[PDB]
Design a protein around this ligand. Structure first.
Ligand SMILES: Nc1nc2c([nH]c(=O)n2[C@H]2C[C@H](O)[C@@H](COP(=O)(O)O)O2)c(=O)[nH]1
Length: 154
C-alpha cells in the first residue's frame, strides 16, 4: 500500500516556479506545490487544490508528466507522487503558511537545496519527457536504491 500525493511544476519557457517549504515534510527545500490527495477528490483536483492553498494560483490545465514512488526505510506506506506540469497559470504567486514562491531560470535550479532525487528526474521534466521513478531513502538525505525510466503513458 501507498498513499497518493501530488506535485505541481509551473514550467514556463525560461523559468520554473518553486516554493521554499516553510514547515512540515521537506521543510527547507525548494519544491513544486502539492500534498496528500483527500478522500472525495481526484488526484488532479487535489493537485489544483494544493497549488491554490500553497501559492494562491489557479490553472487552466494540468498535464500528467510523471510518477515517483518513494520508500522511506521503516515507514510502512510508500508515497505515490503524481507529478503535473502547467504553463497556464492564473494569478501571481503569493506566500502561504507552507510555501514561499520564487521563479528560477532553468539553468539556476537550486538542486543542492532540493530533495536529492530531483537532480535525477528534473532534467527529464525540463526536457519534456514523461517518467516513472522510484527512490528508496534512509531518512531525508540518503538515496539507497533508485530506478528511473522514460515512459509514454504516465
Ligand atoms: N521534488 C520532490 N517532491 C517530493 C519528494 N517527496 C515528496 O513527498 N514530495 C512531494 C509530494 C508533495 O508535493 C509533498 C509532500 O506533501 P506535504 O507538503 O503536504 O507534506 O512533497 C521528493 O523527494 N522530491
Amino acid at each position: 500500500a501507498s498513499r497518493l500525493y501530488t506535485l505541481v511544476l509551473v514550467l514556463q519557457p525560461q523559468r520554473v516556479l518553486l516554493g521554499m517549504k516553510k514547515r512540515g515534510f521537506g521543510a527547507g527545500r525548494w519544491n513544486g506545490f502539492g500534498g496528500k490527495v483527500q478522500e472525495g477528490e481526484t488526484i488532479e483536483d487535489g493537485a489544483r487544490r494544493e497549488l491554490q492553498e500553497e501559492s494562491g494560483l489557479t490553472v487552466d490545465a494540468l498535464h500528467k508528466v510523471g510518477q515517483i514512488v518513494f520508500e522511506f526505510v521503516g515507514e510502512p506506506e510508500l508515497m505515490d507522487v503524481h507529478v503535473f506540469c502547467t504553463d497556464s497559470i492564473q494569478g501571481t504567486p503569493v506566500e502561504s503558511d507552507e510555501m514561499r514562491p520564487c521563479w528560477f531560470q532553468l539553468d539556476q535550479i537550486p538542486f543542492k537545496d532540493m530533495w536529492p532525487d530531483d537532480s535525477y528526474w528534473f532534467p527529464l521534466l525540463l526536457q519534456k519527457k514523461k517518467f516513472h521513478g522510484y527512490f528508496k531513502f534512509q531518512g531525508q538525505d540518503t538515496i539507497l536504491d533508485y530506478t528511473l525510466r522514460e515512459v509514454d503513458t504516465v
